[PDB]
Structure formats: C-alpha cells, structure tokens
CSV table of C-alpha atoms and ligand atoms in Angstrom, one decimal:
chain,number,residue,atom,x,y,z
A,21,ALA,CA,29.3,41.2,13.3
A,22,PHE,CA,28.9,39.5,9.8
A,23,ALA,CA,25.7,37.9,9.2
A,24,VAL,CA,25.1,36.8,5.6
A,25,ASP,CA,21.6,38.7,4.5
A,26,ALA,CA,20.0,36.4,1.8
A,27,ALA,CA,16.5,38.7,1.8
A,28,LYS,CA,18.4,41.9,0.4
A,29,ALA,CA,20.7,39.9,-1.8
A,30,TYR,CA,17.4,38.4,-3.4
A,31,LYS,CA,15.2,41.7,-3.1
A,32,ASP,CA,18.3,43.0,-5.6
A,33,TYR,CA,18.7,40.7,-7.6
A,34,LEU,CA,15.2,40.6,-8.6
A,35,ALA,CA,15.7,44.9,-9.0
A,36,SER,CA,18.4,43.6,-11.3
A,37,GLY,CA,15.9,41.6,-13.5
A,38,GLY,CA,16.7,38.3,-12.6
A,39,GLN,CA,14.9,35.1,-12.7
A,40,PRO,CA,12.5,34.3,-9.4
A,41,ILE,CA,12.7,31.2,-7.7
A,42,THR,CA,11.5,28.5,-9.8
A,43,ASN,CA,9.6,24.9,-8.9
A,44,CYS,CA,7.5,26.3,-5.9
A,45,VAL,CA,5.4,23.7,-5.3
A,46,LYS,CA,1.8,24.9,-6.5
A,47,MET,CA,-1.1,22.7,-4.4
A,48,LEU,CA,-4.4,21.6,-6.4
A,49,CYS,CA,-7.3,22.6,-4.4
A,50,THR,CA,-10.9,24.0,-5.1
A,51,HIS,CA,-9.9,27.9,-4.4
A,52,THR,CA,-12.8,28.6,-2.7
A,53,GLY,CA,-11.0,28.7,0.7
A,54,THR,CA,-10.7,31.8,3.6
A,55,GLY,CA,-8.0,33.2,1.4
A,56,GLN,CA,-5.8,33.5,4.5
A,57,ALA,CA,-2.2,33.8,4.4
A,58,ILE,CA,-0.1,30.7,5.4
A,59,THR,CA,-2.6,28.1,6.6
A,60,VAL,CA,-2.4,24.1,7.8
A,61,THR,CA,-4.1,23.0,4.2
A,62,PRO,CA,-4.6,25.2,1.0
A,63,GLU,CA,-7.0,27.9,1.5
A,64,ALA,CA,-6.7,29.9,-1.9
A,65,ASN,CA,-9.7,32.3,-2.9
A,66,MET,CA,-10.6,32.6,-6.3
A,67,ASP,CA,-7.9,35.4,-6.3
A,68,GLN,CA,-5.2,32.8,-4.9
A,69,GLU,CA,-3.0,29.9,-5.8
A,70,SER,CA,-2.0,27.8,-3.2
A,71,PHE,CA,2.0,26.8,-2.7
A,72,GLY,CA,3.2,24.2,-0.1
A,73,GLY,CA,5.2,26.5,2.1
A,74,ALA,CA,8.5,25.1,2.4
A,75,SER,CA,9.0,25.4,-1.4
A,76,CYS,CA,7.8,29.2,-0.7
A,77,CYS,CA,10.7,30.1,2.0
A,78,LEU,CA,14.0,31.5,0.8
A,79,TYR,CA,15.9,30.1,4.2
A,80,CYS,CA,14.6,26.6,3.6
A,81,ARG,CA,15.2,26.6,-0.6
A,82,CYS,CA,18.7,28.1,-0.7
A,83,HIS,CA,20.2,25.9,2.3
A,84,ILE,CA,20.6,28.8,4.9
A,85,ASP,CA,20.3,29.5,8.3
A,86,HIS,CA,16.7,31.2,9.2
A,87,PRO,CA,17.2,34.5,10.9
A,88,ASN,CA,15.6,34.5,14.4
A,89,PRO,CA,16.9,33.2,17.2
A,90,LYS,CA,15.6,29.6,17.1
A,91,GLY,CA,16.0,29.7,13.4
A,92,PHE,CA,12.0,28.2,13.7
A,93,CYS,CA,10.4,28.5,9.8
A,94,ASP,CA,7.0,29.6,9.5
A,95,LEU,CA,6.5,28.2,6.2
A,96,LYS,CA,7.3,24.6,6.6
A,97,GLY,CA,4.9,22.6,6.8
A,98,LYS,CA,1.7,24.6,6.1
A,99,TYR,CA,0.6,26.2,2.7
A,100,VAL,CA,1.1,30.4,2.0
A,101,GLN,CA,-1.6,31.9,-0.3
A,102,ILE,CA,-0.1,33.8,-2.9
A,103,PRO,CA,-2.5,36.2,-4.8
A,104,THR,CA,-2.5,34.8,-8.3
A,105,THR,CA,-0.9,38.3,-10.6
A,106,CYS,CA,2.2,37.6,-8.1
A,107,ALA,CA,2.4,33.4,-8.1
A,108,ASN,CA,5.1,33.4,-10.9
A,109,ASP,CA,7.4,34.7,-8.0
A,110,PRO,CA,6.0,32.9,-4.3
A,111,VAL,CA,9.2,33.5,-2.3
A,112,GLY,CA,9.4,37.3,-3.4
A,113,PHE,CA,6.3,37.3,-2.7
A,114,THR,CA,6.5,35.5,1.3
A,115,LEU,CA,9.5,37.9,1.7
A,116,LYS,CA,8.2,41.1,0.4
A,117,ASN,CA,5.1,41.2,2.4
A,118,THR,CA,3.4,40.9,6.2
A,119,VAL,CA,0.8,38.9,7.7
A,120,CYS,CA,-1.9,40.8,9.7
A,121,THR,CA,-1.8,39.3,13.4
A,122,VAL,CA,-5.9,39.6,13.5
A,123,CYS,CA,-6.8,38.5,10.3
A,124,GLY,CA,-4.6,36.3,9.1
A,125,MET,CA,-5.0,37.9,5.7
A,126,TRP,CA,-1.9,39.5,3.9
A,127,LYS,CA,-1.4,43.2,4.6
A,128,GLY,CA,-2.6,44.7,1.6
A,129,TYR,CA,-3.7,41.6,-0.4
A,130,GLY,CA,-7.3,41.2,1.7
A,131,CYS,CA,-7.0,42.7,5.1
A,132,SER,CA,-9.6,44.9,5.7
A,133,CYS,CA,-8.8,45.8,9.4
A,134,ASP,CA,-8.0,49.1,8.5
A,135,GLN,CA,-10.7,50.7,7.0
B,5,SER,CA,-14.5,4.7,-20.9
B,6,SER,CA,-16.1,6.2,-17.8
B,7,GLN,CA,-12.4,5.3,-16.0
B,8,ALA,CA,-11.6,9.0,-17.9
B,9,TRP,CA,-13.3,10.9,-15.1
B,10,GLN,CA,-11.7,9.1,-12.4
B,11,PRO,CA,-8.7,9.5,-10.9
B,12,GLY,CA,-7.1,6.3,-12.0
B,13,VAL,CA,-8.1,2.9,-13.0
B,14,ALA,CA,-7.4,-0.2,-10.7
B,15,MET,CA,-6.1,-3.9,-11.7
B,16,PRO,CA,-9.8,-5.8,-12.5
B,17,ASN,CA,-9.9,-8.8,-10.0
B,18,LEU,CA,-9.6,-11.1,-13.8
B,19,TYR,CA,-6.1,-10.4,-14.7
B,20,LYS,CA,-5.2,-11.0,-10.9
B,21,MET,CA,-6.6,-14.5,-11.5
B,22,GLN,CA,-4.3,-15.1,-14.9
B,23,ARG,CA,-1.3,-16.8,-15.7
B,24,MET,CA,0.4,-15.2,-17.9
B,25,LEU,CA,4.2,-14.9,-19.4
B,26,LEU,CA,5.8,-11.7,-18.7
B,27,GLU,CA,6.2,-10.2,-21.8
B,28,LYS,CA,7.8,-7.2,-23.1
B,29,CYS,CA,5.1,-3.8,-21.8
B,30,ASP,CA,4.1,-1.5,-25.0
B,31,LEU,CA,1.6,0.6,-23.9
B,32,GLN,CA,-0.8,2.6,-27.3
B,33,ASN,CA,-0.9,5.8,-25.4
B,34,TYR,CA,2.9,5.6,-24.8
B,35,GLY,CA,4.2,9.1,-25.4
B,36,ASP,CA,1.0,11.1,-25.0
B,37,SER,CA,0.4,13.5,-22.0
B,38,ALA,CA,-2.5,14.4,-20.6
B,39,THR,CA,-2.7,18.3,-20.3
B,40,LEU,CA,-2.4,19.8,-16.8
B,41,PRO,CA,-4.2,22.8,-15.2
B,42,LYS,CA,-1.7,25.5,-15.7
B,43,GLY,CA,1.0,25.6,-13.6
B,44,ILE,CA,0.8,22.1,-12.1
B,45,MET,CA,3.4,19.6,-11.8
B,46,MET,CA,3.3,15.9,-12.7
B,47,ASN,CA,3.8,15.1,-9.4
B,48,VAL,CA,1.2,17.1,-7.4
B,49,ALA,CA,-0.7,15.4,-10.2
B,50,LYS,CA,0.4,12.5,-9.9
B,51,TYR,CA,-0.2,12.0,-6.1
B,52,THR,CA,-3.3,13.7,-5.8
B,53,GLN,CA,-5.0,10.8,-8.1
B,54,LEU,CA,-2.9,8.3,-6.0
B,55,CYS,CA,-4.7,10.5,-3.0
B,56,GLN,CA,-8.2,10.1,-4.7
B,57,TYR,CA,-7.9,6.5,-5.6
B,58,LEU,CA,-7.2,5.7,-1.8
B,59,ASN,CA,-10.0,7.3,0.0
B,60,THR,CA,-12.1,4.8,-2.1
B,61,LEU,CA,-10.1,1.8,0.3
B,62,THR,CA,-11.2,1.0,3.6
B,63,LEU,CA,-7.7,2.9,5.0
B,64,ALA,CA,-7.2,2.9,8.5
B,65,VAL,CA,-7.1,6.5,9.9
B,66,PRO,CA,-6.0,6.5,13.7
B,67,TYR,CA,-6.2,9.5,15.8
B,68,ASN,CA,-2.5,10.6,15.6
B,69,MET,CA,-1.6,8.8,12.1
B,70,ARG,CA,1.6,7.8,11.3
B,71,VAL,CA,3.1,8.1,7.9
B,72,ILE,CA,6.3,7.2,5.9
B,73,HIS,CA,7.4,8.7,2.5
B,74,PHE,CA,10.2,7.3,0.8
B,75,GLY,CA,11.8,8.5,-2.1
B,76,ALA,CA,10.1,12.1,-1.2
B,77,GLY,CA,12.8,14.4,-3.0
B,78,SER,CA,13.0,16.2,-5.9
B,79,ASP,CA,15.5,16.9,-9.0
B,80,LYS,CA,14.6,20.5,-7.6
B,81,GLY,CA,15.2,19.9,-3.9
B,82,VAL,CA,11.9,20.3,-3.4
B,83,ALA,CA,9.3,17.4,-2.0
B,84,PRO,CA,5.7,17.7,-3.8
B,85,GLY,CA,4.1,14.5,-3.1
B,86,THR,CA,4.8,15.0,0.6
B,87,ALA,CA,3.6,18.4,-0.3
B,88,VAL,CA,-0.4,16.4,-1.7
B,89,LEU,CA,0.0,14.4,1.4
B,90,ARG,CA,0.4,16.5,3.9
B,91,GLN,CA,-2.7,18.1,2.2
B,92,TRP,CA,-4.5,15.4,2.1
B,93,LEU,CA,-3.5,13.7,5.4
B,94,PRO,CA,-5.9,14.9,8.8
B,95,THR,CA,-4.2,18.0,10.5
B,96,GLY,CA,-1.5,16.7,13.0
B,97,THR,CA,-0.6,13.8,11.5
B,98,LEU,CA,3.0,12.7,11.8
B,99,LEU,CA,4.7,13.0,8.8
B,100,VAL,CA,8.5,11.5,7.9
B,101,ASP,CA,9.7,11.6,4.5
B,102,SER,CA,13.1,10.2,2.9
B,103,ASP,CA,15.4,10.4,0.1
B,104,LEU,CA,18.8,9.4,-1.1
B,105,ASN,CA,19.4,13.1,-2.4
B,106,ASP,CA,19.0,16.5,0.1
B,107,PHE,CA,15.7,18.3,-0.6
B,108,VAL,CA,13.5,20.7,1.2
B,109,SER,CA,10.2,18.8,2.7
B,110,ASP,CA,7.0,19.8,4.7
B,111,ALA,CA,7.6,16.7,6.1
B,112,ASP,CA,7.5,16.6,10.1
B,113,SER,CA,10.9,15.3,9.5
B,114,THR,CA,13.1,14.3,7.1
B,115,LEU,CA,15.9,11.6,6.2
B,116,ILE,CA,18.8,12.0,3.7
B,117,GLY,CA,20.7,8.7,2.5
B,118,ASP,CA,19.6,5.4,1.1
B,119,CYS,CA,16.4,4.3,1.9
B,120,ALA,CA,18.8,1.3,3.9
B,121,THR,CA,19.9,3.7,6.1
B,122,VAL,CA,16.9,4.7,8.1
B,123,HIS,CA,15.7,3.0,10.8
B,124,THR,CA,12.5,4.0,13.3
B,125,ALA,CA,11.4,2.5,16.7
B,126,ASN,CA,7.7,2.7,16.0
B,127,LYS,CA,5.6,1.3,13.7
B,128,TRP,CA,3.1,3.0,11.0
B,129,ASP,CA,0.2,3.7,9.5
B,130,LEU,CA,0.4,4.2,6.1
B,131,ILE,CA,4.0,3.2,3.4
B,132,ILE,CA,3.8,5.6,0.7
B,133,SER,CA,7.2,4.9,-2.1
B,134,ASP,CA,8.2,6.9,-5.0
B,135,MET,CA,11.6,5.2,-5.4
B,136,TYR,CA,12.8,3.9,-8.8
B,137,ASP,CA,16.1,3.0,-9.8
B,138,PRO,CA,16.3,4.9,-14.0
B,139,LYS,CA,19.5,1.9,-14.5
B,140,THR,CA,16.5,-0.5,-14.0
B,141,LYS,CA,15.3,0.3,-17.8
B,142,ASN,CA,17.5,-1.8,-20.0
B,143,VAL,CA,15.4,-2.7,-22.4
B,144,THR,CA,18.3,-5.4,-24.0
B,145,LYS,CA,18.5,-7.4,-21.2
B,146,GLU,CA,15.8,-10.4,-19.4
B,147,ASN,CA,13.5,-8.2,-16.9
B,148,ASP,CA,13.8,-10.6,-13.4
B,149,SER,CA,12.8,-9.5,-10.1
B,150,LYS,CA,15.0,-6.4,-8.7
B,151,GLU,CA,16.4,-6.2,-5.6
B,152,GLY,CA,18.1,-2.5,-4.2
B,153,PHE,CA,15.4,-0.3,-2.4
B,154,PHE,CA,13.0,-3.3,-2.8
B,155,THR,CA,14.3,-5.3,-0.3
B,156,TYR,CA,14.4,-2.9,2.2
B,157,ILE,CA,10.8,-2.4,1.5
B,158,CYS,CA,10.0,-6.1,2.1
B,159,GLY,CA,11.4,-6.1,5.1
B,160,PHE,CA,10.5,-2.3,6.2
B,161,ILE,CA,6.6,-3.4,5.5
B,162,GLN,CA,7.1,-7.0,7.3
B,163,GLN,CA,8.8,-5.2,11.0
B,164,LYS,CA,7.6,-2.2,10.4
B,165,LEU,CA,3.8,-1.5,9.1
B,166,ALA,CA,0.8,-1.7,11.9
B,167,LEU,CA,-1.4,-4.2,11.9
B,168,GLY,CA,-4.5,-3.0,9.3
B,169,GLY,CA,-2.0,-0.5,8.4
B,170,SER,CA,-1.7,0.3,4.2
B,171,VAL,CA,1.0,1.2,1.4
B,172,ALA,CA,1.7,2.3,-1.8
B,173,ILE,CA,4.6,1.1,-3.7
B,174,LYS,CA,5.1,2.6,-6.9
B,175,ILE,CA,6.9,0.0,-10.3
B,176,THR,CA,7.3,0.1,-13.5
B,177,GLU,CA,7.7,-2.6,-15.9
B,178,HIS,CA,11.3,-2.8,-15.1
B,179,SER,CA,11.3,-1.8,-11.6
B,180,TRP,CA,9.3,-4.2,-9.7
B,181,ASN,CA,10.5,-7.0,-7.0
B,182,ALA,CA,8.2,-10.8,-6.7
B,183,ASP,CA,8.6,-10.7,-3.1
B,184,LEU,CA,6.6,-7.0,-2.7
B,185,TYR,CA,4.2,-8.6,-5.0
B,186,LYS,CA,4.0,-11.9,-3.1
B,187,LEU,CA,3.3,-9.6,0.5
B,188,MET,CA,0.2,-8.2,-1.5
B,189,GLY,CA,-1.2,-11.8,-0.4
B,190,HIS,CA,-0.3,-10.9,3.4
B,191,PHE,CA,-2.6,-8.0,3.1
B,192,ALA,CA,-6.8,-8.1,3.3
B,193,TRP,CA,-6.8,-6.3,-0.2
B,194,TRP,CA,-4.6,-5.6,-2.9
B,195,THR,CA,-4.4,-3.9,-6.5
B,196,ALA,CA,-2.3,-2.5,-9.2
B,197,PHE,CA,-3.5,1.3,-9.2
B,198,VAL,CA,-2.6,3.7,-13.1
B,199,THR,CA,-3.2,7.2,-12.4
B,200,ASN,CA,-5.4,8.8,-15.0
B,201,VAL,CA,-2.3,11.9,-15.4
B,202,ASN,CA,0.3,9.1,-16.2
B,203,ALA,CA,-1.5,6.5,-18.3
B,204,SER,CA,1.1,6.5,-20.4
B,205,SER,CA,3.3,4.8,-18.6
B,206,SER,CA,3.9,1.6,-17.2
B,207,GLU,CA,4.3,2.8,-13.1
B,208,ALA,CA,1.7,1.9,-11.2
B,209,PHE,CA,1.5,1.9,-7.0
B,210,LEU,CA,1.2,-1.3,-5.9
B,211,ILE,CA,-1.2,-0.9,-3.0
B,212,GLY,CA,-1.6,-3.0,-0.2
B,213,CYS,CA,-4.8,-2.6,1.7
B,214,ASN,CA,-5.2,-3.3,5.6
B,215,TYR,CA,-1.9,-5.6,6.6
B,216,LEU,CA,-2.9,-8.7,8.7
B,217,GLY,CA,0.8,-9.8,8.9
B,218,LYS,CA,0.1,-13.6,7.9
B,219,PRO,CA,-0.4,-14.7,4.4
B,220,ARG,CA,-4.0,-14.6,3.4
B,221,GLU,CA,-2.9,-15.9,-0.2
B,222,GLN,CA,-0.3,-17.3,-2.0
B,223,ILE,CA,0.8,-14.9,-4.8
B,224,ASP,CA,3.7,-16.0,-7.3
B,225,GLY,CA,5.2,-12.8,-7.9
B,226,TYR,CA,6.7,-13.5,-10.9
B,227,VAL,CA,3.0,-14.8,-12.9
B,228,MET,CA,1.4,-11.3,-10.9
B,229,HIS,CA,3.6,-8.9,-12.7
B,230,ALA,CA,3.5,-10.7,-16.0
B,231,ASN,CA,-0.4,-10.5,-15.0
B,232,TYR,CA,0.1,-6.4,-14.5
B,233,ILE,CA,2.5,-6.0,-17.6
B,234,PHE,CA,-0.1,-8.3,-19.8
B,235,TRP,CA,-3.5,-6.2,-18.5
B,236,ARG,CA,-1.4,-2.9,-18.8
B,237,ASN,CA,-0.7,-4.3,-22.9
B,238,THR,CA,-4.1,-4.9,-23.6
B,239,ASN,CA,-6.3,-2.3,-22.0
B,240,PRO,CA,-4.9,1.2,-22.9
B,241,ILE,CA,-5.4,3.7,-20.4
B,242,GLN,CA,-6.9,7.3,-21.7
B,243,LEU,CA,-4.9,9.8,-20.0
B,244,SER,CA,-6.9,12.3,-18.4
B,245,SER,CA,-7.2,15.1,-15.5
B,246,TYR,CA,-10.5,15.2,-14.9
B,247,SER,CA,-10.3,14.7,-11.1
B,248,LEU,CA,-8.0,16.8,-10.5
B,249,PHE,CA,-10.6,19.8,-10.9
B,250,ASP,CA,-12.8,18.4,-8.0
B,251,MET,CA,-10.9,18.1,-4.7
B,252,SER,CA,-14.0,19.8,-2.9
B,253,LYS,CA,-13.6,15.8,-1.2
B,254,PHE,CA,-10.0,15.2,-1.3
B,255,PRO,CA,-8.8,15.4,3.0
B,256,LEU,CA,-8.0,11.7,3.8
B,257,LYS,CA,-11.7,11.0,6.0
B,258,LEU,CA,-11.0,11.2,10.2
B,259,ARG,CA,-12.7,8.2,11.2
B,260,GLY,CA,-10.7,7.9,14.6
B,261,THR,CA,-9.4,4.2,14.0
B,262,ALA,CA,-9.1,2.3,17.5
B,263,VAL,CA,-5.0,2.1,18.1
B,264,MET,CA,-4.8,-1.3,20.2
B,265,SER,CA,-1.9,-3.3,21.4
B,266,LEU,CA,-1.8,-6.9,21.2
B,267,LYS,CA,0.5,-10.1,21.1
B,268,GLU,CA,0.7,-12.5,18.5
B,269,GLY,CA,-1.2,-15.1,20.3
B,270,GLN,CA,-4.5,-12.4,21.0
B,271,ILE,CA,-5.0,-12.1,17.3
B,272,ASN,CA,-7.9,-14.2,16.5
B,273,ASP,CA,-10.5,-14.2,13.9
B,274,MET,CA,-12.4,-11.9,15.3
B,275,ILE,CA,-9.4,-9.0,15.4
B,276,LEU,CA,-8.8,-10.3,11.4
B,277,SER,CA,-11.8,-8.8,10.8
B,278,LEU,CA,-11.5,-5.7,12.1
B,279,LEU,CA,-8.5,-5.8,10.7
B,280,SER,CA,-10.0,-6.4,7.5
B,281,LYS,CA,-12.9,-3.9,7.1
B,282,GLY,CA,-10.2,-0.9,8.4
B,283,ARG,CA,-11.4,-0.7,11.1
B,284,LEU,CA,-8.4,-1.5,13.9
B,285,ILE,CA,-4.9,-1.0,14.0
B,286,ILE,CA,-2.8,-2.6,16.2
B,287,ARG,CA,1.0,-1.2,17.4
B,288,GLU,CA,2.0,0.3,20.2
B,289,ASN,CA,1.5,4.2,21.2
B,290,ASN,CA,4.9,5.3,22.2
B,291,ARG,CA,7.3,8.2,20.7
B,292,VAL,CA,8.1,7.9,16.9
B,293,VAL,CA,11.4,8.0,17.0
B,294,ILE,CA,13.6,7.9,13.8
B,295,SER,CA,17.5,7.7,12.8
B,296,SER,CA,19.7,7.6,10.1
B,297,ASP,CA,22.6,5.5,10.3
B,298,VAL,CA,26.2,7.5,9.3
B,299,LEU,CA,29.3,5.5,7.9
B,300,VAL,CA,32.5,7.6,9.3
B,301,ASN,CA,35.9,7.1,6.9
B,302,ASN,CA,38.8,9.1,6.0
C,401,LIG,N1,17.3,3.0,-2.7
C,401,LIG,C1,17.3,4.3,-2.8
C,401,LIG,N2,17.0,5.0,-1.4
C,401,LIG,C2,16.2,6.3,-0.8
C,401,LIG,N3,16.4,7.4,-2.7
C,401,LIG,C3,16.2,6.4,-3.3
C,401,LIG,C4,16.8,4.8,-3.5
C,401,LIG,N4,16.5,5.1,-4.7
C,401,LIG,C5,15.6,6.2,-5.0
C,401,LIG,N5,15.3,6.7,-4.6
C,401,LIG,C6,15.2,8.0,-4.7
C,401,LIG,O1,13.5,7.7,-5.5
C,401,LIG,C7,13.0,9.3,-5.9
C,401,LIG,C8,12.0,9.2,-6.6
C,401,LIG,S1,12.7,8.6,-8.8
C,401,LIG,C9,13.4,10.0,-9.7
C,401,LIG,C10,13.1,9.8,-11.1
C,401,LIG,C11,12.8,8.7,-11.7
C,401,LIG,C12,12.4,8.7,-13.5
C,401,LIG,C13,11.6,9.9,-13.6
C,401,LIG,C14,11.1,9.1,-14.7
C,401,LIG,C15,11.6,8.5,-16.1
C,401,LIG,C16,11.6,8.5,-16.9
C,401,LIG,C17,9.9,9.1,-17.9
C,401,LIG,C18,9.3,9.8,-16.8
C,401,LIG,C19,10.3,10.3,-15.4
C,401,LIG,C20,12.4,11.2,-12.9
C,401,LIG,C21,11.7,12.1,-13.3
C,401,LIG,O2,10.7,12.5,-13.3
C,401,LIG,O3,12.1,13.3,-13.7
C,401,LIG,C22,12.8,11.2,-11.5
C,401,LIG,C23,14.5,10.2,-6.2
C,401,LIG,O4,14.2,11.0,-5.4
C,401,LIG,C24,15.7,9.4,-6.2
C,401,LIG,O5,16.6,10.2,-5.7
C,402,LIG,ZN1,12.1,28.3,5.9
C,403,LIG,ZN1,-6.3,42.2,8.9
C-alpha cells in the first residue's frame, strides 16, 4: 500500500520555511488575456503571470509519476496563469489550488460563479 | 540605430558579398547586458526575439505543421525555448524537442541523448537548433570549421527538411561549420540574425528560409563566416529588450500553406518559384514517428 506522496512532502517543506521550486518558465505576453487558469497559449490578465506548464508541475519537475491511473499531466504542453502576488511559487500555487470546471478560472482567484 | 526597436539585426546583404579573411571577433558591447523585463530569462527573451524576426520572413505554415527543436534542455532541466516555440506556433503544431541531457518539456515528444542518435521517419517544416559545445571557445588555437553536431545537422537538413521548410541554427565565432553556410545557398534566402537581447555575444542564428533542395547559389563557408565576423566586428549592435514589451502580434500567422507530395522529376521552375515564396511544402503527410538509438553494453 506504499506510495510516495510528493504533494504532501512539498506542502510540508514549504510550511517548514523552504525555498520554493525555482526556474519555472515565465512567458512574455500581452497581459490582456482571458485570465483562465490553464490554457493553450499564455492568457495572463493584468494581475497574472503566464508560465510554461511542464515547468510548474511538481511531478514533471521531480521526475516522479503523475498521481492518476494513466499518469496524464494536465499542465505539460499548456500555459498556467498564476496571480502575480503568488508567482514566486508557481508549483506550490498549482498544487494547492483548483480550477473551476465551468468558467475555467482559479476558484478564489477569478472564478465568480458563486456570488 | 532605429534597430533598437527591432527584435534584432540581420546581416546586411552587402556583407554577404564580401571576401574577408577570418579575424578574431572583438565586440565593442562585449560584457554589456540588456535589462530584461522583471523575472524573464535570457532564453525566453532570446527565443521570443528570434520568433519575432521569423514573423517577417516567408515561412511556410501548413496545417499540421511539424517543428523539431534540437538543444532544447537547460542547465536547470526545463525547456524555455520550447515553451516560446509552443506559444509562437499555431495550436496543434507537432513540436518535438531533444537534448543530450534530461529535461522536462512542453513539446509533444522529447528525445534525450546525443542528436546523432535521433531518427525520424517523416520530414519537417521548421528545424530550430540551440546546440552549442562550450569546449569550442578555445581562443589559443586557430578557429576552423567544427564538426560534431554540425555534421548531423547538415545531414538532417538534406534528408529530413521538407522543400519549402526553414531552419534557424545557432552559431558563434568558434561554433560554426563551413558546410552549413554552404547549405544556406540551398534556400531561396538566408541570413545571420543577432537578437537585440544577446547582441553583446558573437552568437547568431543562421536562418535558411524556404528550402529548395538544390544549390541556388554557391557559398564558400569559410569566407562567409569571415564575412559574418567582419560584419559583427565593425557594426556594434546596441543591446535592447524593447521588442519584448509588444507581444500583440507575436503568434506565427496561420497561412494554411499547401502540402504536396512530389517526386524529384516533377519539381519544375514553377514549383521552385512557389517554394521560394513560402507558398508550398513538399513532403508526405503520413504519421510522425521518431526514435532514439540506444547502445546496449555492460
Ligand atoms: N551533440 C549534441 N546533441 C544534443 N544536444 C547537444 C549537443 N551539443 C550540445 N547540446 C545541448 O545544447 C544545449 C544548449 S548549449 C548549452 C549552453 C552553452 C553556452 C552557454 C553560455 C556560454 C557562455 C556565455 C553565455 C552562455 C550556456 C548558458 O546559458 O549557460 C548554455 C545544451 O542543453 C546541451 O546539452
Ligand atoms: Zn506534469
Ligand atoms: Zn467558476
């Protein structure tokens, strides 16, 4: 029943006061984009940075298996938008947050489906 | 220097026509740095400006475009250049990248290993190479044409580049190859392009635009590299990141360029003219299959 839990290990290293994963690939873009979370091209709005997806995926970056049956990555080959105030830790952000399945924004960071 | 608002500077045609002898490269602005936008890597800025310049050429952009990117890994195990290529190329473009060292990538498929172990069944529409051997910068021995990965690259162009396809191959003062220059004469047009962000470096991208498969002009590769160094030595390029701030027209324009399969005997002067204008790709359109040769030992 043993499985490595890297998500939990990273969250705990962050809480311990560890330096977040660096060298996430930040893109140049207009910053007039839709602001959605994970897109086929950079979509950062005025409050977001856009990064190359693979460089922000914990499983990609650590060379470990993706936690799902067929091991698919939903960041690789896409761009992930990160609020500018959290862009110092894109990996942590994507791991600790969730995408609204209806509007495509980050829940709590642009998703307005609950007001 | 209205050049500072361009993505970079291309080698003027009058310098291509010279017959200079090879001198040491000595750049006036050597050691200056452009100031990059906050938190932007050199490799992202550099590939952005490369793509911005390529937007001004007659690149063939077919449906289901095929792009292969050599030398794509970084020292930190990611692929910034590939990420700019994915951003630039039309959605759905098949992008394959490769490097000697392990890295994680946004490309559709990645091969790890020396490029000489890379084989593909299909032909490609655009070949990008950032490969560079840092051992090559030995200032105390003569600067002769280098082989290594350049031998692979010339063969790869000749065998696996679609007619009408294009290339961009990084060179420097000491990392260069006479046959690659001579191959530039097999395209409808060619240049050496220096990005404004890295203009303090002798690096350039040798760009071949619209491959024709036959010599259109004869080019002496030893002379042409000497011409390139002469141009660089006498034409200081002001470092600049200006173009990085306007990305509104960055994406490569979807041209829907026609793909045809043709045998060597039916490529007339009329087809050659279509190729030369970026309006025709000649290759099959089967499945894209790639592999890496693995040597087995104890
Ligand atoms: N035969 C081959 N087959 C497959 N892959 C190959 C092959 N040969 C090379 N490579 C791969 O080329 C990729 C890019 S060259 C790495 C590089 C070079 C120079 C500088 C540099 C030097 C001086 C001043 C400023 C920058 C830097 C850097 O910015 O630190 C990085 C690497 O990842 C290499 O593994
Ligand atoms: Zn991943
Ligand atoms: Zn929502």
